[PDB]
Symmetry: C3
Subunit: 110 residues, 3 copies
């Protein structure tokens, strides 16, 4: 949403001074917790999925990526092991591949 | 900062916990949670601007996207940054925001 | 904690992708997300205490402001931390919390002095 985004920036005209918006822009950047909305919109636009349904996937990816990093998994057949037997094979292998390529760099981010 | 009465009322929920270890975990996780330090920013925005809590989010989500695009493209120009704003946008507001982001594109 | 059935069902939406690049891009940004780590924290809080999302959110915001306040003001004594709680506050919880934060105050200060 970039059209109704500028319709939100206009609310800055309800401010009291140029000092409050000066401290409001500084707090809008460093607070990276607001980056989730950009992640949701880019997920809904790339997968043609609902906002509520995009939240379920992102939590799943977060949960699994954190998991393979926590246990420090370098084994391919170990990654494949936690996938259920009735899981889409090509997607299972695609994920497994991505897990292996980033399991090193991800663990450093802790 | 300080602790409000609502905060102490919220803390008492820990008496519902099954063990003292859960209480210990929740404390550690709450301190380390960077995302939690935004409920105050959400409240400040919603109070000093007299908007909805939802409307407060929409502004912060939009402001974050804007201040991110300033560093993502490293716009050093004071005019090309105002090009992002549409023609039907408040003149004095699009002149103020581009005057701050241009001064905060370095440490970004 | 392992993945649930609902979790694997959610993963299958990745098949709706237009390229393998957006899938790996999704994996990277889902991992390095503080917001996603918080919603996981909310879920177990709601689970353990048998509370709602709102009630759990309040507690975590409460615990966040208090634990940070302890580290910021450097309250390295039980008497100083006990001074924060009102008189009508539950005594046993008052003692448990002031014990927990008297242990981590030193490790919390250092953690904040970094970032």
């Amino acid at each position: 949403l970039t059209a109704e985004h500028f319709a939100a920036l206009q609310s800055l005209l309800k401010a009291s001074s140029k000092d409050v918006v000066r401290q409001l822009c500084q707090e809008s950047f460093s607070s990276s917790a607001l980056g989730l909305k950009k992640l949701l919109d880019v997920t809904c636009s790339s997968l043609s999925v609902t906002q509520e349904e995009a939240e379920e996937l992102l939590q799943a990816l977060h949960r699994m990526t954190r998991l393979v990093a926590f246990r420090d998994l370098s084994s391919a057949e170990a990654i494949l092991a936690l996938f259920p037997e009735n899981f889409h094979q090509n997607l299972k292998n695609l994920l497994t591949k991505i897990m292996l390529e980033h399991v090193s760099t991800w663990r450093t981010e802790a």
